[PDB]
Amino acid sequence: MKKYTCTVCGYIYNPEDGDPDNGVNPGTDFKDIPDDWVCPLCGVGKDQFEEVE
Ligand code: NI
């Protein structure tokens, strides 16, 4: 699974770590994160995140 970066603040979503405190368990594909989830650091939505190739 790919990392994704918040292009407003630079936060790196790492699948292998997830975001457990907001309910996204380790092992979760960015695409499967609930679409109401917001960047933990800056609060913007998935739509500002870009795949890291
Ligand atoms: Ni952010």
Swiss-Prot record:
The keyword Cell cycle does not apply. Residues 1-53 form the Rubredoxin-like domain. SUPFAM superfamilies: Rubredoxin-like. The keyword Amino-acid biosynthesis does not apply. The modification N-formylmethionine is found at M1. Binds 1 Fe(3+) ion per subunit. Belongs to the rubredoxin family. This is Rubredoxin. It comes from Clostridium pasteurianum.
